[PDB]
Amino acid sequence: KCVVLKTSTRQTIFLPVVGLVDPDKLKPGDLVGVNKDSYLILDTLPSEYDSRVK
Amino acid sequence: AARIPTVTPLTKCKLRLLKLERIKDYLLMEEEFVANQERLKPQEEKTEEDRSKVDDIRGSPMSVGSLEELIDENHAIVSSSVGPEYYVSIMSFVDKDQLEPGCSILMHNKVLSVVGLLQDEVDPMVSVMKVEKAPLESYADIGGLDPQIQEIKEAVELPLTHPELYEDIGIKPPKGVILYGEPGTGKTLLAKAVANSTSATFLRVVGSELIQKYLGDGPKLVRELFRVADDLSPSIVFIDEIDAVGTKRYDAHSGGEREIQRTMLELLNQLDGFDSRGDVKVILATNKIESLDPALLRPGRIDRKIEFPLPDIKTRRRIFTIHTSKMTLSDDVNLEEFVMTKDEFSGADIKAICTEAGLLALRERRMKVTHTDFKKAKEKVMFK
Amino acid sequence: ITKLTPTTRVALRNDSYVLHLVLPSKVDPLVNLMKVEKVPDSTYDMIGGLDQQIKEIKEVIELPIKHPELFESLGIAQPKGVLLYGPPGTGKTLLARAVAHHTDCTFIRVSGSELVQKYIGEGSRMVRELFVMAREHAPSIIFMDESEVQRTMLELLNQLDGFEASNKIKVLMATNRIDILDPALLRPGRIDRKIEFPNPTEESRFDILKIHSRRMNLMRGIDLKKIGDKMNGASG
Amino acid sequence: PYSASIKKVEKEIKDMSKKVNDLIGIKESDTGLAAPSQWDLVSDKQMMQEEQPLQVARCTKIINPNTEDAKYVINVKQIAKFVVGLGDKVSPTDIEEGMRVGVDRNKYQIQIPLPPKIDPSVTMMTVEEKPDVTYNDVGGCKEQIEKMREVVELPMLHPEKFVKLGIDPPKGVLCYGPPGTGKTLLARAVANRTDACFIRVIGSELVQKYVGEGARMVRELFQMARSKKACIVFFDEVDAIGGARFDDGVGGDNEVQRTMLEIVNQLDGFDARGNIKVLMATNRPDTLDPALLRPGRLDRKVEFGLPDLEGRTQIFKIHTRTMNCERDIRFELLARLCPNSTGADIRSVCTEAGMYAIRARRKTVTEKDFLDAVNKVIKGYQKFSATPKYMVYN
Amino acid sequence: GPPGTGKTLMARACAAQTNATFLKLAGPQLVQMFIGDGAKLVRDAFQLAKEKAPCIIFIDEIDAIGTKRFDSEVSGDREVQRTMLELLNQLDGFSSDERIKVIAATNRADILDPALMRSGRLDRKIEFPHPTEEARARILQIHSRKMNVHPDVNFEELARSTDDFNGAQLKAVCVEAGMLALRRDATEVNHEDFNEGIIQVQAKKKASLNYYA
Ligand SMILES: Nc1ncnc2c1ncn2[C@@H]1O[C@H](COP(=O)(O)OP(=O)(O)OP(=O)(O)O)[C@@H](O)[C@H]1O
Ligand SMILES: Nc1ncnc2c1ncn2[C@@H]1O[C@H](COP(=O)(O)OP(=O)(O)O)[C@@H](O)[C@H]1O
């Protein structure tokens, strides 16, 4: 019932409400999209590994 | 600025006067054409309105950036001093001639457009090896041998003396001259004369200085010395103590023998690589050439071979009469007595004996030097 | 602008980054290196049983300090090399310290560390880094404790041998096993003079005791002569 | 007669020239500023057009887009990653995943694509100017010249015979010989001869400091080559990049093995370089690794040795094409007076002959002068001679 | 096996053979100056391979990471050993997977670290030797599949003249003959042409053959 996430700029911030996808939709270690303006997680980036392996 | 380079007349002939009159007439016509622009449509001061508008257009606070690529058409890619790569374009006063990686490009403060270039006054490698003042007096202060003085002159100064004599013969100066001789033979004294007589840039390189502690560093130091000397100006760079390539082993460098070997290979490449080094001369000396890498000496990288022997019994006279020119020595002793004191008294031996005699005279604060002072200096010099 | 010393701090506005005021005394890198060194400042009157060596060091270097015209009348070259050798730390270190003390010279003794390298230069490719710090503090002396040590010393000696055009620069290297030094450094023109620190005897320890115990709380009556007799010339 | 009349008039004109040029403005020496008659365009409109119109649009790196929509991903090496999109002035076929491009400084949207970063470490290593070594100036190795041309020039000169013949042209060439035998003197020849780009990889130019920081340079060089149409990469002193693998006990001399392996991989197998011909030159090839010399990567193994009897004559004829010497000189007798000498030795002999002739009084070289020069260059400098220690190739 | 005994050919055949996605990884390719960056590059490799369950990953020149561990204070390629350990962990053991197969190619099995050959990490060890006499002629038939030569060349004869030659050099003899054929401007390749090409491949210059008749 809690939301915990860290920005890509060495900044960590949490939202009392998960967002667009409920915690059932998400799992630890995931990488999703959050609002740069509202600092609210909007969507979930599907996947992207380093192009070196790609 | 470079209006006319024709000075071939060098006399009072009418041709020189006619050329000067034509130049003056052209200058007057240009001035008259330019004056009417302000007389008819000045439209501004053109002296400070332009400068003020440029200052107010380009960002007033100009930062210290770094150019890393080249974009000719109103664009440029660099990295912010904080780190963020930028796509700053080119401004009107760009004068894009220093568009090379590393030169800081100053961008605007409002829009961060390229405002100014970064005048560079560092050259760390060159500075840590640039000779500011002449080391010693003229070649006459070397004394005695002059078997290489003519040879070294032809190798270095003769190309710079009047490089038409070697041009009229249809050849280029010798590649390089390596001065190898007995310990304390005066090789450094030869470089002293080379510098006191030299005309172009000269770089001094400590022999161990080519071997660094971090693996891969030594080749970088060699490449940087080559860039600095070559890219700076016509130079005569002497890497003294070349025997230190592999002779001495130090624990500071992570790499073992395959690091001195890599440094030597890099030096060889920098001497006779795959491009045109330009007008650069090299004069290196060593006291133990028996271990120097054979490839670094093949005719084509180090051409002239010079050997310096100990001062001759006839040359010892000139050496002594030189190193004691200004000494107020008493006539009690005769230098020839100590001239044969040492069976193998090298050039450094005479200077050491003179210095010891001076010191001994000093301990008693006497005005002149006596024979006993020289006798006591001779034992303290050779015998230890 | 001239008063604004280059490589010095001045105040800077925030919204404009315009000059606001000078900054008085920010820092001196050589002072920081010396403080890291923590040199044991001494006094010439506290020198233990090396009086003749004291005059030798004076006559070795200091003479062209209070009387630069001394060698001009005789036409001799300025002495270059002075070294401290003998039993380790036999007072030779203290003699070196007292030399600068009574001579007023910039003391810099290095052990080839890496933290001080952050003040000499970014990479310290050559040994000329220290000279830059000394080059502007002409009233300076160079001291080096006891194989790359010789290499740095070899470069220094070659540097201050005619290639270094600055006059009145003194460097002194101290170490033991003079017969184990570098033969290249053994050139007669490199070491201008040599001084050794022989193990003090009772005749020398008496003053050593008078200096060392001078700062202690003794008992009425000392009788240090017998104790020094019990001291069979150990070291300084 | 009027010595002061003309000098004063000339000085007056020279002073007035500056007195009038200072009235337009060239003075006030700046620190990287252009001529006021060089930035005139940007005064009110162009500056308001070169500045007001455009934006910085800082460049960054892309990761990959997401399907079902544009769904591009924005990533910054030093700033931050982010979900962004391209601009209205880009195509959706060119959405390269992992592409360097700039995004709208405000909209944080990629408005302009960019070519891949150059890594100036391997960008500075392009020739850009062929040497002054021509075919007529590298005489003495005619067979080697033909063999090298068949691999670098002939195959690209008329690429019609090889297609009709039905055989893949030979891949590369390795030139291993005694020191000074003419390796670089021909590599410069290859560079000044053809037109395809030639990359000079100095054998020391690949040993980097960090662990693996050197191999990456190999990949960078290989990419910068494959980027162009046809490339010929000439590496000298190939004895430094990697000799072989001999690890025993404590790991030593292994890092160079990784660099050599990376160089081999980009050179053979897995969609090999293709339109890139290798031209290496080792001076002590005895240590070359079996994998690098194995055919298919450096198939040709041409060797350049000492000219026997006519090579010396050709070297004398070529290297002495601009020397003022007596016409009655017998050069072949000189070529017979040098049992085993290197071509660089022949050029140095011609030089020393020039110097000796210029020494005392002469204006043209003399046969006796060349003879005396031989006695010192070969017969006098024979102490090392650089030949005996490398003749066995060890 | 030998330097050119043939491993790239087997890998390229396997790639076009199976109806899946093959993973191409270069031995030294998986490294970086960052501390452990190679570990991350190998973990991402294993994840991308798990992406398509039907797939094969080939780690060519496995000697780059398979270097035997050493005991020394100063150096020893601790990062390289870390990458090797990461590959070993990702291969089999704690939280391994049975969905794909990896084909590895190493040129000197001796330098290979002992762990790299530990059953779980690698099960089947296949060593490829050089063709002796019959595959020596098969190589010439294959590599000369498109080469046009008149029926005046004895493939077996050239195979017997090509003693102790590698498959790569065996096929390169065909290229050398084709280039010599272009030198001759003819249309077909003569037996003497292949004989001269075999000699040119050896790279043994004759110089006054009198000391040994
Ligand atoms: N066949 C030749 N024709 C003309 N000049 C030659 C020839 N062989 C050598 N030279 C001369 O050799 C010099 C350049 O060749 P260089 O000595 O660099 O060869 P190298 O084998 O690459 O040497 P190293 O391997 O020691 O670097 C020039 O002076 C060049 O004129
Ligand atoms: N006339 C002379 N001939 C030779 N050496 C001389 C002469 N006069 C002085 N010297 C001494 O030669 C030395 C020059 O350095 P050098 O002998 O080249 O040292 P090294 O051989 O150890 O590199 C100095 O010690 C200098 O005093």
mmCIF file of N, CA and C and ligand atoms in Angstrom, chain B residues 140-145 179 181-192 240-241 285-287 308-311 315-316 318-320 322-323 346-352, chain C residues 158 161 183-185 187-190, ligand 2:
data_model
loop_
_atom_site.group_PDB
_atom_site.id
_atom_site.type_symbol
_atom_site.label_atom_id
_atom_site.label_comp_id
_atom_site.label_asym_id
_atom_site.label_seq_id
_atom_site.Cartn_x
_atom_site.Cartn_y
_atom_site.Cartn_z
ATOM 1 N N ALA B 140 83.523 28.147 -27.360
ATOM 2 C CA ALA B 140 84.907 28.215 -26.907
ATOM 3 C C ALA B 140 85.069 27.755 -25.465
ATOM 4 N N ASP B 141 83.982 27.714 -24.692
ATOM 5 C CA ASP B 141 84.083 27.314 -23.295
ATOM 6 C C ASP B 141 84.109 25.802 -23.123
ATOM 7 N N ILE B 142 83.862 25.038 -24.189
ATOM 8 C CA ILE B 142 83.926 23.582 -24.114
ATOM 9 C C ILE B 142 85.386 23.166 -24.013
ATOM 10 N N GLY B 143 86.154 23.423 -25.070
ATOM 11 C CA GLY B 143 87.596 23.310 -24.996
ATOM 12 C C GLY B 143 88.183 21.931 -25.221
ATOM 13 N N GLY B 144 89.241 21.871 -26.030
ATOM 14 C CA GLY B 144 90.096 20.712 -26.140
ATOM 15 C C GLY B 144 89.800 19.778 -27.297
ATOM 16 N N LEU B 145 88.596 19.213 -27.371
ATOM 17 C CA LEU B 145 88.348 18.161 -28.357
ATOM 18 C C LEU B 145 88.033 18.739 -29.734
ATOM 19 N N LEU B 179 75.662 11.173 -28.886
ATOM 20 C CA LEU B 179 76.943 11.422 -28.239
ATOM 21 C C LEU B 179 77.154 10.389 -27.142
ATOM 22 N N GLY B 181 80.074 8.432 -24.776
ATOM 23 C CA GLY B 181 81.429 8.604 -24.294
ATOM 24 C C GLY B 181 81.561 8.102 -22.871
ATOM 25 N N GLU B 182 82.787 8.188 -22.364
ATOM 26 C CA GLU B 182 83.082 7.710 -21.026
ATOM 27 C C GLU B 182 82.327 8.537 -19.989
ATOM 28 N N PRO B 183 82.097 7.974 -18.805
ATOM 29 C CA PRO B 183 81.369 8.718 -17.772
ATOM 30 C C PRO B 183 82.034 10.055 -17.481
ATOM 31 N N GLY B 184 81.213 11.097 -17.390
ATOM 32 C CA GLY B 184 81.731 12.429 -17.156
ATOM 33 C C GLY B 184 82.572 12.973 -18.285
ATOM 34 N N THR B 185 82.380 12.470 -19.501
ATOM 35 C CA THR B 185 83.151 12.899 -20.658
ATOM 36 C C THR B 185 82.839 14.325 -21.086
ATOM 37 N N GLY B 186 81.774 14.928 -20.562
ATOM 38 C CA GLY B 186 81.427 16.275 -20.965
ATOM 39 C C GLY B 186 80.323 16.336 -21.999
ATOM 40 N N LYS B 187 79.635 15.213 -22.211
ATOM 41 C CA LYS B 187 78.504 15.207 -23.132
ATOM 42 C C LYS B 187 77.519 16.314 -22.785
ATOM 43 N N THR B 188 77.143 16.414 -21.508
ATOM 44 C CA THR B 188 76.315 17.533 -21.073
ATOM 45 C C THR B 188 76.987 18.867 -21.367
ATOM 46 N N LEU B 189 78.314 18.936 -21.241
ATOM 47 C CA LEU B 189 79.016 20.154 -21.621
ATOM 48 C C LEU B 189 78.857 20.445 -23.107
ATOM 49 N N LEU B 190 78.730 19.402 -23.933
ATOM 50 C CA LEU B 190 78.483 19.616 -25.355
ATOM 51 C C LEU B 190 77.098 20.198 -25.597
ATOM 52 N N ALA B 191 76.076 19.658 -24.932
ATOM 53 C CA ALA B 191 74.751 20.256 -25.012
ATOM 54 C C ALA B 191 74.745 21.683 -24.489
ATOM 55 N N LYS B 192 75.600 21.994 -23.515
ATOM 56 C CA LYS B 192 75.715 23.372 -23.054
ATOM 57 C C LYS B 192 76.070 24.305 -24.206
ATOM 58 N N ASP B 240 68.798 13.128 -22.765
ATOM 59 C CA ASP B 240 70.027 12.684 -22.128
ATOM 60 C C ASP B 240 69.755 11.434 -21.306
ATOM 61 N N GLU B 241 70.803 10.645 -21.075
ATOM 62 C CA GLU B 241 70.708 9.413 -20.298
ATOM 63 C C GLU B 241 69.688 8.457 -20.926
ATOM 64 N N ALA B 285 72.525 11.633 -25.874
ATOM 65 C CA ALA B 285 73.819 11.164 -25.406
ATOM 66 C C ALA B 285 73.610 10.070 -24.373
ATOM 67 N N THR B 286 74.579 9.165 -24.279
ATOM 68 C CA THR B 286 74.527 8.082 -23.307
ATOM 69 C C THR B 286 75.951 7.693 -22.943
ATOM 70 N N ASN B 287 76.102 7.133 -21.743
ATOM 71 C CA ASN B 287 77.395 6.671 -21.265
ATOM 72 C C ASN B 287 77.563 5.161 -21.334
ATOM 73 N N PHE B 308 83.080 10.616 -27.482
ATOM 74 C CA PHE B 308 83.835 11.587 -26.713
ATOM 75 C C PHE B 308 84.824 10.878 -25.804
ATOM 76 N N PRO B 309 86.120 10.978 -26.072
ATOM 77 C CA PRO B 309 87.118 10.364 -25.196
ATOM 78 C C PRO B 309 87.572 11.335 -24.111
ATOM 79 N N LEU B 310 88.342 10.800 -23.169
ATOM 80 C CA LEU B 310 88.835 11.614 -22.073
ATOM 81 C C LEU B 310 89.771 12.697 -22.603
ATOM 82 N N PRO B 311 89.899 13.812 -21.887
ATOM 83 C CA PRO B 311 90.768 14.890 -22.371
ATOM 84 C C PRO B 311 92.188 14.393 -22.584
ATOM 85 N N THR B 315 95.249 18.139 -24.746
ATOM 86 C CA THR B 315 93.985 18.810 -24.477
ATOM 87 C C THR B 315 93.800 19.149 -23.006
ATOM 88 N N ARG B 316 94.392 18.360 -22.105
ATOM 89 C CA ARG B 316 94.298 18.666 -20.682
ATOM 90 C C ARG B 316 94.826 20.062 -20.387
ATOM 91 N N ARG B 318 94.615 22.816 -22.351
ATOM 92 C CA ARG B 318 93.549 23.766 -22.641
ATOM 93 C C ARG B 318 92.417 23.655 -21.629
ATOM 94 N N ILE B 319 92.061 22.432 -21.229
ATOM 95 C CA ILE B 319 90.995 22.263 -20.248
ATOM 96 C C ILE B 319 91.341 22.985 -18.952
ATOM 97 N N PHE B 320 92.565 22.791 -18.455
ATOM 98 C CA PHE B 320 92.979 23.455 -17.225
ATOM 99 C C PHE B 320 93.042 24.966 -17.395
ATOM 100 N N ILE B 322 91.330 26.701 -19.205
ATOM 101 C CA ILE B 322 89.973 27.214 -19.340
ATOM 102 C C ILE B 322 89.268 27.245 -17.991
ATOM 103 N N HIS B 323 89.176 26.094 -17.325
ATOM 104 C CA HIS B 323 88.408 25.999 -16.090
ATOM 105 C C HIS B 323 88.976 26.848 -14.960
ATOM 106 N N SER B 346 89.813 12.593 -16.344
ATOM 107 C CA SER B 346 88.831 13.022 -17.327
ATOM 108 C C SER B 346 88.574 14.522 -17.198
ATOM 109 N N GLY B 347 87.718 15.043 -18.079
ATOM 110 C CA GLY B 347 87.407 16.461 -18.043
ATOM 111 C C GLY B 347 86.811 16.909 -16.726
ATOM 112 N N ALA B 348 85.885 16.124 -16.173
ATOM 113 C CA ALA B 348 85.309 16.469 -14.878
ATOM 114 C C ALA B 348 86.366 16.490 -13.783
ATOM 115 N N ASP B 349 87.437 15.711 -13.944
ATOM 116 C CA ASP B 349 88.490 15.687 -12.936
ATOM 117 C C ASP B 349 89.153 17.048 -12.780
ATOM 118 N N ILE B 350 89.427 17.739 -13.887
ATOM 119 C CA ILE B 350 90.068 19.047 -13.801
ATOM 120 C C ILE B 350 89.173 20.034 -13.063
ATOM 121 N N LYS B 351 87.883 20.062 -13.405
ATOM 122 C CA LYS B 351 86.961 20.959 -12.719
ATOM 123 C C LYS B 351 86.856 20.623 -11.240
ATOM 124 N N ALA B 352 86.793 19.334 -10.900
ATOM 125 C CA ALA B 352 86.742 18.949 -9.496
ATOM 126 C C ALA B 352 87.997 19.385 -8.754
ATOM 127 N N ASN C 158 71.226 16.993 -11.764
ATOM 128 C CA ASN C 158 71.346 17.462 -13.137
ATOM 129 C C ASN C 158 70.591 18.766 -13.350
ATOM 130 N N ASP C 161 72.590 22.078 -11.888
ATOM 131 C CA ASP C 161 73.987 21.904 -12.257
ATOM 132 C C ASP C 161 74.417 22.799 -13.410
ATOM 133 N N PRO C 183 76.786 5.398 -8.186
ATOM 134 C CA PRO C 183 78.042 5.866 -8.790
ATOM 135 C C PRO C 183 77.846 7.042 -9.729
ATOM 136 N N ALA C 184 76.708 7.114 -10.423
ATOM 137 C CA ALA C 184 76.426 8.280 -11.251
ATOM 138 C C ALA C 184 76.351 9.548 -10.413
ATOM 139 N N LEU C 185 75.733 9.472 -9.237
ATOM 140 C CA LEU C 185 75.706 10.587 -8.302
ATOM 141 C C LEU C 185 77.057 10.840 -7.650
ATOM 142 N N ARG C 187 79.802 11.544 -9.162
ATOM 143 C CA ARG C 187 80.651 12.389 -9.987
ATOM 144 C C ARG C 187 81.259 13.493 -9.128
ATOM 145 N N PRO C 188 82.534 13.837 -9.329
ATOM 146 C CA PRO C 188 83.163 14.837 -8.451
ATOM 147 C C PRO C 188 82.457 16.181 -8.450
ATOM 148 N N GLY C 189 81.830 16.577 -9.555
ATOM 149 C CA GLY C 189 81.151 17.853 -9.618
ATOM 150 C C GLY C 189 79.752 17.885 -9.053
ATOM 151 N N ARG C 190 79.184 16.729 -8.708
ATOM 152 C CA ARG C 190 77.834 16.700 -8.156
ATOM 153 C C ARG C 190 77.842 17.035 -6.669
HETATM 154 N N1 LIG F 2 86.767 20.677 -21.051
HETATM 155 C C1 LIG F 2 85.953 19.758 -20.544
HETATM 156 N N2 LIG F 2 85.836 18.568 -21.178
HETATM 157 C C2 LIG F 2 85.009 17.651 -20.661
HETATM 158 N N3 LIG F 2 84.244 17.721 -19.575
HETATM 159 C C3 LIG F 2 84.378 18.911 -18.969
HETATM 160 C C4 LIG F 2 85.189 19.950 -19.380
HETATM 161 N N4 LIG F 2 85.075 21.025 -18.516
HETATM 162 C C5 LIG F 2 84.217 20.624 -17.615
HETATM 163 N N5 LIG F 2 83.750 19.352 -17.830
HETATM 164 C C6 LIG F 2 82.782 18.644 -17.003
HETATM 165 O O1 LIG F 2 81.985 17.835 -17.832
HETATM 166 C C7 LIG F 2 80.734 17.557 -17.150
HETATM 167 C C8 LIG F 2 79.603 17.612 -18.149
HETATM 168 O O2 LIG F 2 78.656 16.543 -17.879
HETATM 169 P P1 LIG F 2 78.939 15.083 -18.472
HETATM 170 O O3 LIG F 2 80.387 14.794 -18.378
HETATM 171 O O4 LIG F 2 78.277 14.913 -19.792
HETATM 172 O O5 LIG F 2 78.193 14.130 -17.434
HETATM 173 P P2 LIG F 2 77.696 12.630 -17.691
HETATM 174 O O6 LIG F 2 78.713 12.026 -18.621
HETATM 175 O O7 LIG F 2 77.663 11.956 -16.343
HETATM 176 O O8 LIG F 2 76.331 12.755 -18.316
HETATM 177 C C9 LIG F 2 80.664 18.558 -15.987
HETATM 178 O O9 LIG F 2 80.943 17.885 -14.766
HETATM 179 C C10 LIG F 2 81.770 19.562 -16.328
HETATM 180 O O10 LIG F 2 82.295 20.224 -15.197
#
